[PDB]
Write an enzyme that holds these catalytic residues in place. Structure first.
Site, mmCIF file in Angstrom:
data_model
loop_
_atom_site.group_PDB
_atom_site.id
_atom_site.type_symbol
_atom_site.label_atom_id
_atom_site.label_comp_id
_atom_site.label_asym_id
_atom_site.label_seq_id
_atom_site.Cartn_x
_atom_site.Cartn_y
_atom_site.Cartn_z
ATOM 1 C CD1 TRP D 160 -0.169 -1.644 3.042
ATOM 2 C CD2 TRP D 160 0.724 0.396 3.232
ATOM 3 N NE1 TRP D 160 0.656 -1.648 4.141
ATOM 4 C CE2 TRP D 160 1.213 -0.404 4.279
ATOM 5 C CE3 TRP D 160 1.143 1.727 3.150
ATOM 6 C CZ2 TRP D 160 2.105 0.080 5.232
ATOM 7 C CZ3 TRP D 160 2.029 2.206 4.092
ATOM 8 C CH2 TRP D 160 2.501 1.387 5.120
ATOM 9 C CE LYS D 184 -3.980 -8.561 -2.002
ATOM 10 N NZ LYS D 184 -4.706 -7.584 -1.145
ATOM 11 C CB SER D 238 5.676 -8.426 5.640
ATOM 12 O OG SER D 238 4.658 -9.402 5.504
ATOM 13 C CD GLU D 260 11.834 -6.653 -5.393
ATOM 14 O OE1 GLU D 260 12.248 -5.825 -4.551
ATOM 15 O OE2 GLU D 260 12.477 -6.960 -6.421
ATOM 16 C CB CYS D 294 10.840 -1.606 1.050
ATOM 17 S SG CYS D 294 11.235 -1.035 -0.603
ATOM 18 C CE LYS D 340 -0.775 -4.291 9.951
ATOM 19 N NZ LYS D 340 -0.769 -5.535 9.126
ATOM 20 C CE1 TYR D 342 -0.570 8.156 15.239
ATOM 21 C CE2 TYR D 342 -1.522 6.724 16.931
ATOM 22 C CZ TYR D 342 -1.077 7.970 16.517
ATOM 23 O OH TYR D 342 -1.147 9.024 17.399
ATOM 24 C CD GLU D 391 10.359 -3.054 6.644
ATOM 25 O OE1 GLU D 391 9.806 -4.170 6.713
ATOM 26 O OE2 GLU D 391 10.651 -2.502 5.561
HETATM 27 N N1 LIG Z 1 10.277 -3.709 -3.383
HETATM 28 C C1 LIG Z 1 10.269 -4.165 -2.012
HETATM 29 O O1 LIG Z 1 11.119 -4.942 -1.638
HETATM 30 C C2 LIG Z 1 9.189 -3.654 -1.020
HETATM 31 C C3 LIG Z 1 8.443 -2.561 -1.384
HETATM 32 C C4 LIG Z 1 7.476 -2.065 -0.536
HETATM 33 C C5 LIG Z 1 7.256 -2.674 0.695
HETATM 34 N N2 LIG Z 1 7.993 -3.763 1.070
HETATM 35 C C6 LIG Z 1 7.724 -4.348 2.358
HETATM 36 O O2 LIG Z 1 6.134 -4.572 2.532
HETATM 37 C C7 LIG Z 1 5.854 -4.451 3.813
HETATM 38 C C8 LIG Z 1 4.753 -3.413 4.079
HETATM 39 O O3 LIG Z 1 3.488 -3.942 3.727
HETATM 40 P P1 LIG Z 1 2.627 -4.786 4.778
HETATM 41 O O4 LIG Z 1 3.501 -5.491 5.808
HETATM 42 O O5 LIG Z 1 1.659 -3.854 5.476
HETATM 43 O O6 LIG Z 1 1.768 -5.823 3.903
HETATM 44 P P2 LIG Z 1 1.772 -7.427 3.977
HETATM 45 O O7 LIG Z 1 3.157 -8.003 3.962
HETATM 46 O O8 LIG Z 1 1.025 -7.861 5.234
HETATM 47 O O9 LIG Z 1 0.976 -7.900 2.652
HETATM 48 C C9 LIG Z 1 1.410 -7.333 1.414
HETATM 49 C C10 LIG Z 1 0.430 -7.807 0.304
HETATM 50 O O10 LIG Z 1 0.286 -9.095 0.433
HETATM 51 C C11 LIG Z 1 -1.269 -9.384 0.786
HETATM 52 N N3 LIG Z 1 -1.365 -10.447 1.722
HETATM 53 C C12 LIG Z 1 -1.473 -10.340 3.052
HETATM 54 N N4 LIG Z 1 -1.541 -11.586 3.567
HETATM 55 C C13 LIG Z 1 -1.471 -12.471 2.543
HETATM 56 C C14 LIG Z 1 -1.495 -13.848 2.509
HETATM 57 N N5 LIG Z 1 -1.606 -14.705 3.648
HETATM 58 N N6 LIG Z 1 -1.407 -14.494 1.340
HETATM 59 C C15 LIG Z 1 -1.295 -13.787 0.167
HETATM 60 N N7 LIG Z 1 -1.275 -12.420 0.199
HETATM 61 C C16 LIG Z 1 -1.360 -11.771 1.399
HETATM 62 C C17 LIG Z 1 -1.725 -8.282 1.276
HETATM 63 O O11 LIG Z 1 -3.191 -8.138 1.058
HETATM 64 C C18 LIG Z 1 -0.950 -7.196 0.507
HETATM 65 O O12 LIG Z 1 -1.531 -6.955 -0.690
HETATM 66 C C19 LIG Z 1 7.114 -3.921 4.478
HETATM 67 O O13 LIG Z 1 7.676 -4.884 5.237
HETATM 68 C C20 LIG Z 1 8.045 -3.529 3.304
HETATM 69 O O14 LIG Z 1 9.453 -3.716 3.710
HETATM 70 C C21 LIG Z 1 8.965 -4.272 0.219
HETATM 71 C C1 LIG Z 2 13.023 11.223 -4.479
HETATM 72 C C2 LIG Z 2 13.963 10.509 -5.425
HETATM 73 O O1 LIG Z 2 13.307 10.332 -6.681
HETATM 74 C C3 LIG Z 2 13.955 9.755 -7.744
HETATM 75 C C4 LIG Z 2 15.227 10.160 -8.160
HETATM 76 C C5 LIG Z 2 15.681 9.431 -9.266
HETATM 77 S S1 LIG Z 2 14.480 8.256 -9.751
HETATM 78 C C6 LIG Z 2 13.335 8.664 -8.530
HETATM 79 C C7 LIG Z 2 12.020 7.980 -8.397
HETATM 80 O O2 LIG Z 2 11.316 7.835 -9.383
HETATM 81 N N1 LIG Z 2 11.635 7.564 -7.197
HETATM 82 C C8 LIG Z 2 10.222 7.383 -6.900
HETATM 83 C C9 LIG Z 2 10.148 6.017 -6.244
HETATM 84 N N2 LIG Z 2 10.924 6.123 -5.018
HETATM 85 C C10 LIG Z 2 10.754 5.123 -4.067
HETATM 86 C C11 LIG Z 2 11.071 5.296 -2.727
HETATM 87 C C12 LIG Z 2 10.861 4.235 -1.852
HETATM 88 C C13 LIG Z 2 10.339 3.022 -2.302
HETATM 89 N N3 LIG Z 2 10.151 2.015 -1.345
HETATM 90 O O3 LIG Z 2 9.015 1.210 -1.366
HETATM 91 O O4 LIG Z 2 11.095 1.853 -0.335
HETATM 92 C C14 LIG Z 2 10.019 2.871 -3.652
HETATM 93 N N4 LIG Z 2 9.497 1.726 -4.273
HETATM 94 C C15 LIG Z 2 10.066 0.399 -4.111
HETATM 95 C C16 LIG Z 2 9.622 -0.267 -5.407
HETATM 96 C C17 LIG Z 2 8.592 0.629 -6.084
HETATM 97 C C18 LIG Z 2 8.381 1.851 -5.197
HETATM 98 C C19 LIG Z 2 10.234 3.926 -4.515
HETATM 99 C C20 LIG Z 2 11.842 7.227 -4.810
HETATM 100 C C21 LIG Z 2 12.597 7.276 -6.132
#
Ligand SMILES: NC(=O)c1ccc[n+]([C@@H]2O[C@H](COP(=O)([O-])OP(=O)(O)OC[C@H]3O[C@@H](n4cnc5c(N)ncnc54)[C@H](O)[C@@H]3O)[C@@H](O)[C@H]2O)c1
Ligand SMILES: CCOc1ccsc1C(=O)N1CCN(c2ccc([N+](=O)[O-])c(N3CCCC3)c2)CC1
Lengths: 492, 492, 492, 492
Positions: D160, D184, D238, D260, D294, D340, D342, D391
């Site tokens: 989200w 989803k 997560s 991820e 993340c 949650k 918060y 985290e």
């Molecule tokens: N690119 C990345 O690596 C990346 C990016 C953003 C966030 N994150 C991580 O996501 C986490 C934040 O989101 P969150 O913890 O509130 O969401 P979450 O981990 O609880 O769930 C994420 C998604 O998975 C769905 N989901 C939940 N339970 C599920 C289940 N049992 N089976 C299948 N799908 C399920 C959820 O509806 C949601 O869409 C953070 O830990 C963050 O580090 C990683």
């Molecule tokens: C503010 C910096 O701006 C820049 C500068 C060069 S490029 C770019 C950009 O476009 N951005 C937007 C997406 N940015 C971001 C930050 C944190 C997370 N995060 O979830 O930790 C994520 N994502 C993880 C995967 C998808 C989204 C993305 C910040 C960078």
């Protein structure tokens, strides 16, 4: 190791179709030892008629269905690794030849040149069965793929400053891709290349796959450049002769051309650099291989704050450089290749004194047997001097001063050459700024003369055309063929 | 669609630094309608003097810190995308211009050429931020990476038979890689290219990135090929002038050279092929674009058992081919480009008659105005004949016969040209044996003239050097810089 | 060559940290000769506690600044080259072990299995210094590149049907990429793997780089799958255990998982094919290696037109297949690996007769000294028989019939397996329509069981996750790191 | 730019086969504004029944011969390019939606998030017709090539914190490779995903290529992960749920998994860094997107020499960080996503205080409505505290001290996560050494956090498997098929 005692010179004839042949003309030419002036031997002198026989053999070796074309690519590779084994076995003999013929100090020829020769062959042994084409998601109902085929007969021409190393840089990628080779070593230094002929048959390369034709440039070389049965020419040498090669290729065959030409490369030392390290690396960047390096850091730009102390340390270092017999372990620097180069260097040294440059040390020949020149250092060099603009190809170091990064970037790039460049600094922002700004095929940060077979090498501007070594260097030794096939429907 | 009725020729001036200019001499030159001989308009004639300030414009656009140099690579792609959108918007006007000026059937210009222009620009728009260098695991304490940078100012010379499409093939990869361009279109056909200057301006390309200099070969062309301020030249493509390009390159500043030259391409029909399909494909291979294609098409080898039936159906189809006005939707074949080409085709037809070839149909021009030639078919053609050796840029089909797959592979490859080849067969072993053995840059299996944007195109032997289109077309428009950084320790 | 007569099995201990060790428990397990029933020797039985010591050894050997991490990539390749040298030297010993332990005919183990091993090591020796990252023309004032680093400790679990070749296929790409390895050979066939341990020490590999732990699946195998200190697992085996592997990876530390799983692979024979050849290829496609091949062409679909004669030639060929002792040159087919697999075959064979297929020949055991099974051919097989849905993994050939190309593609794809497929045909359109539509990781046209180190190999659907071998195989043993540097200005 | 004042939520239904559906149960779920707690709208709640219908729409759209399978690769690029044009057109509405639903400052969503969405689609629009296989030079008489097909039906689950952007990161590569998609979005933020369904339909995607199912984790998310008709799962979220996803994929149909899974990423500040730049960038690295990142630099290591000054400047910057309404252009920080999150932040802050870390500012919620938290800085954090290990996903900055590069390398890497890292220094040797020793998929030097479409992005260790974005992001969305053709002779 120690030099081979009483080195026998047993391979002196032309190498065609895995057989030793005489001149068609009967003529031979002498080979000299630049450390003593004596004549080592006489080598059969190739001319146009011998080139035509070499091209015929290389063309027949390349014919469809031949042993070389049918061979598994992985077996071309093992042939190249077998050559590496043989060069390793005969290492001390070959380093003795390069020392006796090229004036290279023996330990340098053993541990530098020959190591690179063996590593080059082992590197390209790995590539032969890893040259890939592609398949392409093309518009319409077609299946399209490329094949990377050998071009065919490759004519190769190399200079005298790194005879055995150049030889390997040329034939290893050519063979790895499946070409056949007509290679003309420098007339100054044919001996190691000819010995390589014996190893090449001993390794078991089919006859005609490699043909080694020693002889002169305007005869054997120009015969290669203009020959209508040669598909590609790789030339390493001076810029002016490179112009002739490109002219000859367009006028004759439209053969593909790679050019590796001259340099006047800048070495940029910033004040924040390690002074001990940058001085020794800039000294090696000038004086390595008797100063007979296309990669010579011959325009050392030093930041004002350290220029004077840099000049003092470089002078002390040059004043201690041991010149003498290549066979002596203590010798750092051997002779220049011949009298013509020897005089070319001294007239240049005179030009710098006649212009306004301060001669710190050196400046004269040594008077010994052979062509030995004192390690020479000019300070107060300015961009207009012949010294700062012409390739010296000798043991002459030139130190210039600069103030701002923008200034020295301008002046480094203000040149018709662009082979290589270096920057010494611990600051990451000006390290990447300068390196990105240089118009040169290789940029070194906090090092110099870091060359290997894994990395592409070649010139910007008039320093060359195309690239050698690495995965990029293989592109110049294959032709791309697109095969497009009509298919009924196509999905994915 | 239908041709734009009156069609105004708005853009007749030289395009330099995003401004329209008169020639420095004040001279204009005429442009003709090949279907009527009438003068369509006059165009400012660029000479050496206009080339000089175009190169100056392009060099300034390429200098460090400029808008074009600083642009995100992805935004380089966006401009190429906006340009394709503008071409698609004005697609009817450009198709009318290619038809009026080049004699192409308007429907062909609309659905084939102009589609190939829009797709070229869209393909390379996507490549701009996907040009990758590499990082290399070299020996020793080093971090070695390679950057791909633009070469600089690229001089580009194209012919008349696919004006707008070749214009796209040339500027699109060059711009995709960050170069600036000085392009001279063919003196016969400058109109499409000049309209592009208007769309290049409307799209927002920085001033000086693209300069379009109409004029002649010995003047504007030779000034570009010898210009000491141009870093790379791309030429298309008679083989005679290609020799002069490569010679002038080595003679001047050793600029990098890509050549796309002549062809005399074999089309091999085996007896086991879809005969109805092969007849129509081999007929489209020779008569497409009035036979004015480097990819003809022009040596059709037919297996003995189907030779009589193949000839019979080819003659039936040539006799039915509709020659006439390009604006007429029923026209399959317009005129030839001008009087000199017309005369060359008619002389080569005579030589075919004068050597024992069977003139099955055609042989003379049609009507009194324009440069229309009847569709001509020769059978019983043999290898030594002039028509079988020289390229007839005209509607002239030549049918040879063969037995044995090995014989026809010899005869197909026995040629100084190697641009293109095709094989028609349903047998997978025949198709793959012949396509692998062909000495041609493009081999089509069971199709002809399948030239997609995604796939590289170029000649073996004297048909050119290097490749255009595909990922490999990018390779001609970048210089490779190796940056080698000394590092403290190095782990995998 | 002839097998080493009375061969001592010298190496029976666990191989950790270049040391030979007893199991922590002191337990041992028996190793059997399958042609004879008798016990060959006893091997230390690894369990979780030994896997923990091995991982600890592998983790310390992978730490920064260790010998293995600081070794030049080229030196990794040289080590893999030395290993192939040694395997070649002891080729007779290793083939004899492979016969005496796995029950393969010694001739086919010497000339097929051991050639595959030597060629695998030699192939991946060449990749070591040719694994390249990229430099990326990224938006913004940044310099971005990627490093390709080893992942760390790789756990590897392999089956018993190609023990030595599976061993090479696993460690060669893993070590080429710089990882350290904990490998568990099959409980049935650990001997050649343990012999390889001694050559590994002799070759020069640093301690802990390869650790070999013989033992059972639920103990040693599961310990590797759920070990929190292992970064990646490569598992080759049954689909049912593959599901357990991926599950255990998820429950533990989310290690990366590549699975090479089961197959029930189709083999499609069209009428327009060489019967003679196609019958011998479909025969070998199911009877090679005693039928114990995951690639076995176990669903032979034949065009109606030739179903009649295909069965007759296949049955004639199976009735001739020579079953006997592996050390006899006349033996084509040795025994199955053990009684469990033996009883699994005939039980599945019984289902074929009980479900309504024609037992054309074979179908029973031999004289029970060893687990020999007479070559068996089922004709008139239907898509729903257990014989057609379940992996038999023995000398049993299922022959079905088909009418339409679209019918057979639908039938061949109706499966949860998709490891491999083959089409025999001379029609290019059929060959390409069928190969493109097959849901299989490897499609052979007019051949079978063509597998090298050079070619990616893996399953679609429930036959696997990821790919092995070739360049694409290297991607699985490497972790991508993106490094982005802020720079003061970008020039693109 | 200004928010779309009223913004009706038009699109609240389940999007299957390009039609808006009601939930099979009729249930809806509420969507809240995190700045006010007020309910924004109701949305159809997808469950297992809805996923089932979405899989068979996606499966029929993926059938051989369908519009989506037969369409030119380049045309998929055009559709992706059209979707970017449409997102660009409705940029204001989507940024208002993201701000209203996700709590992001509107200007942040407009200029950062939405620019990233548009650029993502345009980047992968370019890749569609540039996905190549290879042709491999294998031993024997074979023609071996690979095709890169789409995998099939790809289920996708996202969080989200960047709702629209992560939607773009998921579908762009999947569609670029030619798969179909069941995605989803997170239960908190489905709105901008659903609006994209409207644009997907308007852009002309075939029905069923993209299906969007809003709903909850254990219901719609788990049905995706354990579905036997889904070939690949792409999960962002997560680590805890990531374990369940990989476990579910092993227990079901062995679908391919990419994960991820976020981190606890180190940010290393050396004393030789641009101090004010580093303070601001480490601030952004923590507090960007309300700390719900993340990539959050949640362990800032500062060299002891500058620690005290860094802490003081961080406290000042954090105390002046404007917290308030997303729609106010002054606001830098909006609210957390829900009650949650918060509560989980407030608890962790309490844990830091209880364990002795010095709370320098903040530490409490802000106001009475919404979920705003005071920007919070912790002074003397040690590696063993819960806040240093877990985290937080909140506006909580944690500053640690260090003395030695080798110390901080160990401490940075001592963690089960490894998503991202950064180092700030002007010394080139420090930047290289630290960036190379980091166990992280992305290392920034002197920046934070540059995430482009061109750069691969993913975790080490338990931060994920595989990569997103760049060219390597496409590898997870293709199956590789090797085709091997027997050929009569083969010439290399
Ligand atoms: N690119 C990345 O690596 C990346 C990016 C953003 C966030 N994150 C991580 O996501 C986490 C934040 O989101 P969150 O913890 O509130 O969401 P979450 O981990 O609880 O769930 C994420 C998604 O998975 C769905 N989901 C939940 N339970 C599920 C289940 N049992 N089976 C299948 N799908 C399920 C959820 O509806 C949601 O869409 C953070 O830990 C963050 O580090 C990683
Ligand atoms: C503010 C910096 O701006 C820049 C500068 C060069 S490029 C770019 C950009 O476009 N951005 C937007 C997406 N940015 C971001 C930050 C944190 C997370 N995060 O979830 O930790 C994520 N994502 C993880 C995967 C998808 C989204 C993305 C910040 C960078």
């Amino acid at each position: 190791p120690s030099p081979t005692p009483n080195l026998e010179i047993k391979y002196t004839k032309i190498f065609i179709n895995n057989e030793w042949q005489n001149s068609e003309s009967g003529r031979v030419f002498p080979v000299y030892n630049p450390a003593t002036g004596e004549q080592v031997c006489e080598v059969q002198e190739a001319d146009k008629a011998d080139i035509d026989k070499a091209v015929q053999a290389a063309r027949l070796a390349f014919s469809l269905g031949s042993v070389w074309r049918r061979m598994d690519a992985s077996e071309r590779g093992r042939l190249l690794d077998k050559l590496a084994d043989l060069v390793e076995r005969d290492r001390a003999v070959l380093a003795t030849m390069e020392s006796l013929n090229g004036g290279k100090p023996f330990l340098q020829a053993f541990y530098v040149d020959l190591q690179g020769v063996i590593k080059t062959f082992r590197y390209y042994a790995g590539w032969a069965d890893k040259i890939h084409g592609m398949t392409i998601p093309v518009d319409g109902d077609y299946f399209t793929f490329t094949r990377h085929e050998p071009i065919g007969v490759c004519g190769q021409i190399i200079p005298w400053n790194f005879p055995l190393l150049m030889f390997a840089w040329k034939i290893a990628p050519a063979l790895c891709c499946g070409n056949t080779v007509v290679i003309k070593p420098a007339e100054q230094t044919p001996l190691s290349a000819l010995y390589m002929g014996a190893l090449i048959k001993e390794a078991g390369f089919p006859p005609g796959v490699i043909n080694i034709l020693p002889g002169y440039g305007p005869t054997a070389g120009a015969a290669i450049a203009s020959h209508i049965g040669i598909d590609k020419i790789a030339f390493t040498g001076s810029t002016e002769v490179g112009k002739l090669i490109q002219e000859a290729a367009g006028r004759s065959n439209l053969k593909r051309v790679t050019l590796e030409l001259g340099g006047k490369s800048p070495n940029i030392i910033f004040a924040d650099a390690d002074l001990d390290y940058a001085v020794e690396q800039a000294h090696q960047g000038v004086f390595f291989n008797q100063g007979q390096c296309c990669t010579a850091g011959s325009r050392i730009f030093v930041e004002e704050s350290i220029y004077e102390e840099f000049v003092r340390r470089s002078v002390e270092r040059a004043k201690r450089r041991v010149v003498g017999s290549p066979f002596d372990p203590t010798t750092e620097q051997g002779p220049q290749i011949d009298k013509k180069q020897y005089n070319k260097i001294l007239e240049l040294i005179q030009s710098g004194v006649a212009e306004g440059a301060k001669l710190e040390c050196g400046g004269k020949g040594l008077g010994r047997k052979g062509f030995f020149i004192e390690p020479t250092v000019f300070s107060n060099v300015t961009d207009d001097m012949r010294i700062a603009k012409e390739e010296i190809f000798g043991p002459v170091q030139e130190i210039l001063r600069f103030k701002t990064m923008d200034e020295v970037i301008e002046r480094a790039n203000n040149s018709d050459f662009g082979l290589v460049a270096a920057v010494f600094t611990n600051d990451i922002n000006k390290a990447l700024t300068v390196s990105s700004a240089m118009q040169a095929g290789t940029v070194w940060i906090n090092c110099y003369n870091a060359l290997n077979a894994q990395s592409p090498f070649g010139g910007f501007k008039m320093s060359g055309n195309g690239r050698e070594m690495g995965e990029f260097g293989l592109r110049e030794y294959s032709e791309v063929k697109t095969v497009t096939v009509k298919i009924p429907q196509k999905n994915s």
